[PDB]
Subunit: 199 residues, 2 copies
């Protein structure tokens, strides 16, 4: 049969960082395949408070060991993201970059794969990164704003305050992420979102 995934009803539950939710899809399987609902406006708008504004949809394909992140968008205008792994498996990480937040400088990892097919929603001011666990992995992202190079920034994914437990011994970083500021450096230059503003 190959691996046959678990049947499920949709659920939306908060993670440990305010403004971040994990979505369990509505999923069924039969001998011809698998079908799932991974976003539903009525379920989402009730839980989060408003429908997701679709401004852009993206895909990324990454090889095993690639660590990408921690990326965020300035607030204002902010950007929210709804992320899922459509092929393979990733260790997905959200980072609270909102100065003043109770969970500022905390992170949380979620396994996003093509078996459970969970999604993560992250609100404005939240940073995002991931590590491909599978030999290659494909993420699909729905974003509430379009790409603007003036507002997209990042912090170093090997930052020592975060000390993220990436599931690879040899993280493959792009020049952009290798050269990114430490969290404290970004903070010290006034580059991070403020929790009051994101609220």
């Amino acid at each position: 049969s190959g691996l046959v995934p678990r049947g499920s009803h949709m659920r939306l539950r908060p993670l440990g960082i305010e403004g971040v939710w994990e979505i369990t899809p509505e999923q069924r399987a039969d001998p011809r395949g698998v079908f799932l609902d991974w976003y539903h406006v009525d379920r989402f708008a009730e839980a989060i408070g408003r429908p997701l504004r679709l401004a852009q949809a993206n895909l990324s394909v990454s090889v095993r060991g690639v660590v990408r992140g921690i990326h965020f968008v300035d607030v204002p205008p902010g950007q929210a993201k709804y992320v899922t792994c459509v092929r393979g498996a990733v260790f997905d990480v959200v980072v609270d970059l909102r100065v003043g937040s109770p969970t500022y400088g905390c992170w949380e990892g979620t396994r996003l794969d093509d078996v459970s097919r969970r999604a993560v929603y992250l609100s404005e001011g939240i940073g995002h990164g991931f590590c491909a666990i599978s030999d290659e992995a494909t993420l699909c992202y729905l974003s509430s704003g379009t790409y603007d190079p003036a507002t997209e920034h990042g912090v170093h994914p090997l930052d020592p305050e975060l000390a993220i437990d990436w599931p690879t011994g040899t993280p493959l970083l792009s020049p952009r992420d290798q050269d990114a500021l430490l969290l404290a450096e970004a903070r010290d230059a006034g580059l991070l979102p403020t929790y009051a503003t994101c609220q």
Copy 2:
């Protein structure tokens, strides 16, 4: 390197059925992976006339030879869909079911795969189906309305007026699609959308 896909700017071009467009993504590749924009609200709203309303997002995984379709939603309220193949390859088919349309009872097939990573947008009253070409294939769909069992209907994918050239000798149909009405039967019972209404 594995297969390295073509770099591209986004394009939206009309197919042969009014209300149906093919989207070429903005895509880049480097040694760590592939990144693409497969929906962009400014590009889309300019071409189609309005931003895509995100009501539901779905995924389907199908084995080779599975033919699914031809499905549509009653108008009103209608439903528009934005479809792409995120893994594998499918022969994707749109069918003009709008009585009175110049292209009523015509179809058009597009290869949606994980190499070119094109998307198809189909407006209200347009039917949709596909055949998995790869051993398994994963489609991702963004829809402007949520699932309502009262409004989702179909016609037989082996209908003789359409005579769709499915790239399999042995189409695997679900009981639902095996039992679906012929196009002329649906028409004769008043079950099809009207072009004036969709307009």
